[PDB]
Amino acid sequence: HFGQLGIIFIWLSGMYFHGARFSNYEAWLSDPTHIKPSAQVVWPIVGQEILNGDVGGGFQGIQITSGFFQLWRAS
Amino acid sequence: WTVPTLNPDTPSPIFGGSTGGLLRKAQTEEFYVITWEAKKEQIFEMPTGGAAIMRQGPNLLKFGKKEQCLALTTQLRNKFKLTPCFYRVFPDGKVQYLHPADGVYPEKVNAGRVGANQNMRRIGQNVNPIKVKFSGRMMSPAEI
Amino acid sequence: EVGPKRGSLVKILRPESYWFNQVGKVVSVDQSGVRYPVVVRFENQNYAGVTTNNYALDEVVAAK
Amino acid sequence: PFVPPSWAPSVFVPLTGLVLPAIAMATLFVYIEKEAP
Amino acid sequence: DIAGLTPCSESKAYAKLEKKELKTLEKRLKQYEADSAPAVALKATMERTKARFANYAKAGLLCGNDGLPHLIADPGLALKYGHAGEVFIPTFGFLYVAGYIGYVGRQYLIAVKGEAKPTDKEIIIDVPLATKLAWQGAGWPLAAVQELQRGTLLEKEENITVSPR
Amino acid sequence: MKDFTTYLSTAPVIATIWFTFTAGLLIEINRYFPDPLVFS
Amino acid sequence: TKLFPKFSQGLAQDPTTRRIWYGLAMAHDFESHDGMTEENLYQKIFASHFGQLSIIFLWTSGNLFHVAWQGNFEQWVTDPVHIRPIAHAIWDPHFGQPAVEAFTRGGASGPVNISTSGVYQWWYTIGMRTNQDLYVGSVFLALVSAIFLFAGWLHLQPNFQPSLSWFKDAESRLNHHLSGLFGVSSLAWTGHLVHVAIPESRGQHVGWDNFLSVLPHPQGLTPFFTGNWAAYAQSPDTASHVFGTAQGSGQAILTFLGGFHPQTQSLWLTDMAHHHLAIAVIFIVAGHMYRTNFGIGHRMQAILEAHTPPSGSLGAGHKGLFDTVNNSLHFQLGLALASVGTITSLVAQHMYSLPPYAFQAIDFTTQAALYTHHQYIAGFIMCGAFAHGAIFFIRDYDPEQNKGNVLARMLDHKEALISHLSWVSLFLGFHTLGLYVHNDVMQAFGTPEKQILIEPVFAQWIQAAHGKALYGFDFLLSSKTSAAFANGQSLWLPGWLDAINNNQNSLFLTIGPGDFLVHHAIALGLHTTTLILVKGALDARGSKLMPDKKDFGYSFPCDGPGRGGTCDISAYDAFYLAVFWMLNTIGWVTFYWHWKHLTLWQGNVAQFDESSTYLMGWLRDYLWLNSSQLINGYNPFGMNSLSVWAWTFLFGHLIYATGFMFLISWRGYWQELIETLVWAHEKTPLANLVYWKDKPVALSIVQARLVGLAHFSVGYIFTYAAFLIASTSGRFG
Amino acid sequence: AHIVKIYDTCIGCTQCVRACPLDVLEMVPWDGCKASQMASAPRTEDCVGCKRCETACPTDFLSVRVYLGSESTRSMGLSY
Numbered sequence A: 001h002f003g004q005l006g007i008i009f010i011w012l013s014g015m016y017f018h019g020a021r022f023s024n025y026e027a028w029l030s031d032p033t034h035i036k037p038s039a040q041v042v043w044p045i046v047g048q049e050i051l052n053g054d055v056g057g058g059f060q061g062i063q064i065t066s067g068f069f070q071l072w073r074a075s
Numbered sequence B: 001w002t003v004p005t006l007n008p009d010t011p012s013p014i015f016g017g018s019t020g021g022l023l024r025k026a027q028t029e030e031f032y033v034i035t036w037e038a039k040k041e042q043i044f045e046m047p048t049g050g051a052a053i054m055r056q057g058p059n060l061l062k063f064g065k066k067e068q069c070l071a072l073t074t075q076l077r078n079k080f081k082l083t084p085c086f087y088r089v090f091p092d093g094k095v096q097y098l099h100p101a102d103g104v105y106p107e108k109v110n111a112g113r114v115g116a117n118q119n120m121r122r123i124g125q126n127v128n129p130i131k132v133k134f135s136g137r138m139m140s141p142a143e144i
Numbered sequence C: 001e002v003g004p005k006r007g008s009l010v011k012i013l014r015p016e017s018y019w020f021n022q023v024g025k026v027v028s029v030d031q032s033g034v035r036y037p038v039v040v041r042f043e044n045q046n047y048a049g050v051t052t053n054n055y056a057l058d059e060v061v062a063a064k
Numbered sequence D: 001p002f003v004p005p006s007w008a009p010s011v012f013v014p015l016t017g018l019v020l021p022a023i024a025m026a027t028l029f030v031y032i033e034k035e036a037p
Numbered sequence E: 001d002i003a004g005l006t007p008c009s010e011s012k013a014y015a016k017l018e019k020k021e022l023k024t025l026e027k028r029l030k031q032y033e034a035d036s037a038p039a040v041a042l043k044a045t046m047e048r049t050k051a052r053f054a055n056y057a058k059a060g061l062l063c064g065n066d067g068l069p070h071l072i073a074d075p076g077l078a079l080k081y082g083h084a085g086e087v088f089i090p091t092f093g094f095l096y097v098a099g100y101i102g103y104v105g106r107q108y109l110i111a112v113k114g115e116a117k118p119t120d121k122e123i124i125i126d127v128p129l130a131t132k133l134a135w136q137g138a139g140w141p142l143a144a145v146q147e148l149q150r151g152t153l154l155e156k157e158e159n160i161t162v163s164p165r
Numbered sequence F: 001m002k003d004f005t006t007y008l009s010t011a012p013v014i015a016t017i018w019f020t021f022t023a024g025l026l027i028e029i030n031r032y033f034p035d036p037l038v039f040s
Numbered sequence G: 001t002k003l004f005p006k007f008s009q010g011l012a013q014d015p016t017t018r019r020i021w022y023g024l025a026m027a028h029d030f031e032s033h034d035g036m037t038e039e040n041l042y043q044k045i046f047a048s049h050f051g052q053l054s055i056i057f058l059w060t061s062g063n064l065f066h067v068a069w070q071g072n073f074e075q076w077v078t079d080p081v082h083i084r085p086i087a088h089a090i091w092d093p094h095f096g097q098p099a100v101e102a103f104t105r106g107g108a109s110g111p112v113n114i115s116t117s118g119v120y121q122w123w124y125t126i127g128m129r130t131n132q133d134l135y136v137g138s139v140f141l142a143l144v145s146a147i148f149l150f151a152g153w154l155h156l157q158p159n160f161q162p163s164l165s166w167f168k169d170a171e172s173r174l175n176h177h178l179s180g181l182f183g184v185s186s187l188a189w190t191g192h193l194v195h196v197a198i199p200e201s202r203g204q205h206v207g208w209d210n211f212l213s214v215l216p217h218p219q220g221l222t223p224f225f226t227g228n229w230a231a232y233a234q235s236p237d238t239a240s241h242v243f244g245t246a247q248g249s250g251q252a253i254l255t256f257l258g259g260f261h262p263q264t265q266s267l268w269l270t271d272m273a274h275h276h277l278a279i280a281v282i283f284i285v286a287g288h289m290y291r292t293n294f295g296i297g298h299r300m301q302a303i304l305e306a307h308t309p310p311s312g313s314l315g316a317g318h319k320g321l322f323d324t325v326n327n328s329l330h331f332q333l334g335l336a337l338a339s340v341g342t343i344t345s346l347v348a349q350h351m352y353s354l355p356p357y358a359f360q361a362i363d364f365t366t367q368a369a370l371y372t373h374h375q376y377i378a379g380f381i382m383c384g385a386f387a388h389g390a391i392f393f394i395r396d397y398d399p400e401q402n403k404g405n406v407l408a409r410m411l412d413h414k415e416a417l418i419s420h421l422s423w424v425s426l427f428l429g430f431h432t433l434g435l436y437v438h439n440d441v442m443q444a445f446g447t448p449e450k451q452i453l454i455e456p457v458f459a460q461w462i463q464a465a466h467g468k469a470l471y472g473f474d475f476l477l478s479s480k481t482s483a484a485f486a487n488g489q490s491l492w493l494p495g496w497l498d499a500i501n502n503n504q505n506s507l508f509l510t511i512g513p514g515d516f517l518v519h520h521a522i523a524l525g526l527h528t529t530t531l532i533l534v535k536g537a538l539d540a541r542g543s544k545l546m547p548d549k550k551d552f553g554y555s556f557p558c559d560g561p562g563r564g565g566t567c568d569i570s571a572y573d574a575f576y577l578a579v580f581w582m583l584n585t586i587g588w589v590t591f592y593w594h595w596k597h598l599t600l601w602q603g604n605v606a607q608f609d610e611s612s613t614y615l616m617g618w619l620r621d622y623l624w625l626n627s628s629q630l631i632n633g634y635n636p637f638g639m640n641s642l643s644v645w646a647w648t649f650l651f652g653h654l655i656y657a658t659g660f661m662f663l664i665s666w667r668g669y670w671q672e673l674i675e676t677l678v679w680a681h682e683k684t685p686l687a688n689l690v691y692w693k694d695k696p697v698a699l700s701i702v703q704a705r706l707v708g709l710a711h712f713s714v715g716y717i718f719t720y721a722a723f724l725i726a727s728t729s730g731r732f733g
Numbered sequence H: 001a002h003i004v005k006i007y008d009t010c011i012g013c014t015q016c017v018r019a020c021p022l023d024v025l026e027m028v029p030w031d032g033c034k035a036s037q038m039a040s041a042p043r044t045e046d047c048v049g050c051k052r053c054e055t056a057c058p059t060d061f062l063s064v065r066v067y068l069g070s071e072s073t074r075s076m077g078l079s080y
């Protein structure tokens, strides 16, 4: 059970880290109703960079549906 | 050793009852009775579901099919180290005894038994299905 | 004085055996005139997990 | 001469879809259940 | 040209396709700044798109009415008209690697059959031996042929188990 | 350390390293030679 | 004990419901009946064949009767281009008024169904013009059905039962069937075309009342008996001929024009007359090959015994095969299904590209249904061909009498055969699926120019050899200087070349990279289905996991959980698994045929050329795009004539999904559930007064596989039939 | 009733008899093996076809074989 808890913390840490480094959270706070949350960015290889969509805030990335932006704002 | 005679008045274990017991088959075709001696009162598991307490001394149970009787026999023999025997009872009142057929459990070799359905060859020496064709019925090469 | 020597390698010739055309090590040979005296052991188990089997004198031949 | 009457479907559709199946099922059910002498 | 196809460099539909893809990228570009991170990424994509369409035309591929490159597989037609690089040359490129992988694995499998416990050498790989066999596989076509001629490539029919028949 | 290097030699660990290496090589080749369709 | 089934005492003694199910399922396995002898086996089969023949002619009679009674044949013949044929009338008391109005069409009295079987075009082509023509045919075939039924009864009677040796006279039966059944029937059919069909196509009525006083050709039999047979090919129907009328018509009765009638877009009648006359001569001649009571001809045993290669490459050769084939009915049935199954595919391939019936091409729904119909029937027959080949090995194969011949040697290298079929299936699947997925990723990322499109040069090269000049190969018939082009330039090439280079017809459609991928998927289907069926036959007699499988029969549940588990180990189960792959293969074939033709029929062939190279195009542009009208047959606003196909479409999905239940969940779960139902009934007051006579039990292991496969197949067929007809008919019809 | 046959490769291990959940099999004296005993199938009318005996046989191929045959109340394992 300690191993399961340790894995969740790595997973939770990754979600918070990717919000800090690969997200448009700061832009989202200013214009929450027009900017789509995004916290994942893909590398430009084999033409997969098209998955970096136009989400708003001068940012390109995959739109997320996990609701982490709303949770962070509430806290 | 002589064939035991069933005693219908033998006491039965302390059991509340369940819905997994005998059905209308017992009243029309047959049912099975298992009897044994108990050294002390103990709790055992009914093959039909639930737990029952065996009285000290003779015990008797009735089951719907043979496999249920021999399933209880395995429990009593292996765990509680008893020696049960069961019968086949017909609605007309006839009682047929079996297991142990000759008084000795089949796992142990006993003189006087006659081999049955024994082929003095290997599986690979059976004839081909074509050679047992049109024999009046579907017959495997192993039968002949 | 009957059958191959203990520990020698033999090739199985029973078509219905899992080890047909395969090499095994002779463990013992019964001298009581039984139907299948030769006992052979194999390094690879069959579908039932067994690695030993009994064979008749004419069902086993020396390696090559 | 060949043309059937204009009312033929009204009789044959119920006859072959509701009546004959009922008799056929009753015939088959009795037959399979019948015991040998 | 071949089978009614035309060189992509001379194909009208092929040229129009490039404009469509660049136009799509340009449309997204004008919603960003000149030197912002999204703008730089989009410009990089457009450069690769232009390079890709130049390379395929320069390679002398054939385009259909769809205006997309089509490949020639017949060795005679490929060598006749200089399309050997589409399928023919890559055919012998793959087989060398495929035989390399298969030959190396077969050498390792034979090597451990001599060991006391071959099964434990398969779940737990003998890395020093595997690396040794990995490098020697570069000459597999030579070694493979010599085994065939010496008759040690195949097992004897009498040493292979078969079911009753 | 002998046992630890034995653990790294187990099939799942070797496959992970091998495919991580194999995938990386293919990814890097396509990074420096993007869009290869014909040998040319 | 129970009477039913009378042919098996084992079943009749069973007290459970398995007796009812198994009695039905073993009725026609005569070899397994109690007291069966070889002679009685052949006489029952002979009688059963008369019953099948009578059903076929009665089924045909019913079609003729209903079209005449309720169809619009006489109206359709006037304007076949712009009239939908009527199959039969509808009398459904469950219909509401909107439904009655919706299905009223074609100027009919009431609701009717539109025909899709093409019998209108077929019957119109062969000379039928009025409803009375169909009525007389219907009564004639009903009479023929009765006669065959009587013959089935007659040859079961004490003095008319053939002996066992009669059924095994191979030389005499082949002589009669080749010369009489094939040759004379084709010669007679030539008579109909010369005397009836062709004149009717030129506006001249010929019937039983006047055909003896009408001359098929202006020169009556003088050219025939004088050897001047070319006189019959002079003055053929001109390109301006209007079918069924005398304007633009000719006089020839035997020609080799080689093309399509310009108006009807179908084969000329004078070519189909010369075709049947030609093969009739060949078949009548070919029927004088074998020995009979007259001291000339071959004996088939001698031919087989001779053909042994001197080098011993085929071992004993064909020695002993005559008895192997002549004594086994499963060997003969396997050869019959394999041959007939292949010919059924050939019919589908050639009928869509060489339409023989007038105005068949323009009826898109009919063409789609006819091709799908026969390809699915061919697929089932092929699976049966291998099933009975597997049954032959278990039941009829005798190793001693086939020692060292070709058949025995097939079992010798069965692992080699199966291993190589396995390799081909894996190779085709890996690379066929891989290229499709590659093209899908390229389309998803917006780079359609990066996908792998391989030109079908080998198939496009064949089309060049036949005269298709699009690809510029200038090969054989595509080159005007080749001897092949010159020699045929006066007989059939002008018509053939004109048709093959017309891109609006289905004669050698243009192919591209989209056709390359689909064809290789078809090869995967054929090889994998063969792999499953071939393994089921070669391993039928035994395997390492079950060395003595022959002792258990063709169909048994399993050998138990021992030795690792033996589920689906019988040869019956190999066939059962192969049916899934057959449906999958025929599905790919019929999707490919349908989509390539819908785009042609709409004129936008570019859609198939562009969207067929990746699998999203199929799902988007074929399945999803063409379902729009089907699923709107009935909606919250109303319904239209397609509501029956909309209803049948969901009906198919339900039967298909129900089949999953019998295939996924197995017996042990259900038998224990039924035991509580037995308990509940006995303890319920006022219901335990009633009781059963057959003890309820779960379906058997083998039965549920068949029941699950039957639901799977039925749902498969009904779903696509509704979609195929609805998408094609609504779009154009 | 199912068919159960014992073949002469039996080594008299008794495992088939122990495994059988309906007392169909038994051991009898024999002279064809070291154990001097052979399996027997005197009560096949009670056999249900579970094939637990075949699972327990060590010999290869099996020395005890079960051929499922005609069904009945006993062989179908019904208690109703």
Ligand code: CLA
Pocket: D013, D014, D016, D017, D018, G093, G094
């Ligand atoms: C070809 C087969 C067939 C036929 C002919 C019918 C016919 C009918 N069905 Mg349908 N039905 C069928 C198959 C068929 N069904 C099947 C297979 C199912 C299961 C999927 C159903 C399920 C079903 C339901 C659930 C319902 C119908 C109903 C109806 C009626 C609709 C029309 C109406 O308004 O009646 C109005 C009916 C009358 C005015 C009375 C008609 C005559 C009655 C029913 C019998 C009279 C008997 C007579 C007095 C004595 C015996 C005479 C006999 C010996 C000759 C009609 C009687 C509806 C209905 O009303 O049923 C009663 C209805 O609710 N059917």
Ligand code: CLA
Pocket: E074, E075, E076, E077, E080, G457, G458, G461
């Ligand atoms: C997979 C089978 C296959 C098929 C269907 C074809 C088909 C074709 N090939 Mg190819 N070819 C193949 C495999 C195949 N090839 C292989 C494995 C090789 C060796 C690596 C070649 C080597 C080859 C050469 C060198 C040439 C062709 C050519 C051709 C074309 C005409 C001659 C021909 O091969 O006729 C049908 C094919 C066969 C019966 C199979 C064997 C073909 C042999 C190997 C080549 C025959 C060349 C021929 C004598 C050239 C005469 C001059 C020509 C202009 C008429 C035709 C499109 C010729 C071409 O370019 O025509 C435009 C040509 O010059 N092929």
Ligand code: CLA
Pocket: G045, G046, G049, G050, G053, G166, G167, G169, G172, G173, G176, G177, G180, G181, G182, G185
């Ligand atoms: C000239 C004599 C003669 C004739 C005409 C027949 C005829 C027949 N015999 Mg044979 N038979 C003969 C002599 C003859 N026999 C002799 C001498 C013996 C003793 C040795 C036998 C012993 C014998 C047996 C034991 C059996 C037969 C059977 C049959 C029937 C086979 C099924 C069938 O109808 O196929 C019809 C087949 C065709 C018309 C040809 C099919 C192949 C073509 C190429 C298909 C395509 C054609 C065309 C394009 C289709 C157009 C379709 C249309 C919709 C447009 C058939 C009626 C079987 C039967 O059914 O008995 C009741 C049977 O069991 N015969």
Ligand code: CLA
Pocket: G024, G025, G026, G027, G028, G029, G030, G333, G337, G380, G381, G383, G384, G385, G387, G388, G391, G554, G555, G572, G575, G710, G714
């Ligand atoms: C002319 C060809 C022909 C002939 C004469 C036979 C004859 C025979 N076959 Mg063979 N067979 C054939 C074609 C043929 N087969 C084909 C085409 C296939 C592939 C599908 C097979 C596959 C096959 C197998 C797998 C087996 C046989 C077996 C048999 C034997 C027993 C049949 C039996 O009892 O059926 C009894 C019939 C049934 C239980 C019902 C059949 C109908 C099925 C389940 C489909 C029903 C669909 C339904 C009507 C749809 C309703 C739709 C709804 C909307 C209303 C018998 C000798 C069996 C045998 O004993 O072989 C030794 C056997 O194991 N055949």
Ligand code: CLA
Pocket: G422, G425, G426, G427, G428, G429, G430, G433, G528, G531, G532, G577, G578, G580, G581
């Ligand atoms: C879509 C469903 C599907 C698929 C993909 C397959 C695929 C296969 N079947 Mg199966 N089959 C199916 C349904 C399917 N079947 C059904 C419904 C039945 C009825 C029970 C059967 C019954 C059946 C039988 C009886 C047989 C097959 C056989 C085969 C093989 C045919 C050859 C082939 O294509 O090799 C190429 C292989 C494939 C296309 C398989 C998929 C490969 C994927 C894409 C690889 C992905 C790898 C990648 C690195 C990702 C991994 C991720 C993971 C680690 C998380 C293949 C493995 C035959 C066989 O085994 O021949 C050797 C065979 O005998 N099938």
Ligand SMILES: CC1=C(/C=C/C(C)=C/C=C/C(C)=C/C=C/C=C(C)/C=C/C=C(C)/C=C/C2=C(C)CCCC2(C)C)C(C)(C)CCC1
Pocket: G330, G331, G333, G334, G335, G338, G342, G385, G386, G388, G389, G390, G392, G534, G537
């Ligand atoms: C298992 C088994 C079986 C079965 C089998 C089968 C089912 C098979 C099938 C098979 C098949 C199904 C096959 C097929 C084949 C085919 C072919 C082989 C073809 C050929 C062709 C050709 C050769 C052609 C040519 C040509 C062309 C191409 C063009 C022009 C014209 C001509 C003619 C020249 C039996 C019964 C025996 C029994 C035993 C076992």
Ligand code: SF4
Pocket: H006, H009, H010, H011, H012, H013, H014, H015, H016, H017, H038, H039, H056, H057, H058, H059, H063, H064
């Ligand atoms: S049949 Fe098998 S398990 Fe039973 S006694 Fe013989 S060897 Fe032992």
Ligand code: SF4
Pocket: H004, H019, H020, H021, H022, H023, H024, H025, H046, H047, H048, H049, H050, H051, H052, H053, H054, H066
């Ligand atoms: S099949 Fe089951 S009941 Fe029959 S002998 Fe074997 S173990 Fe006993």
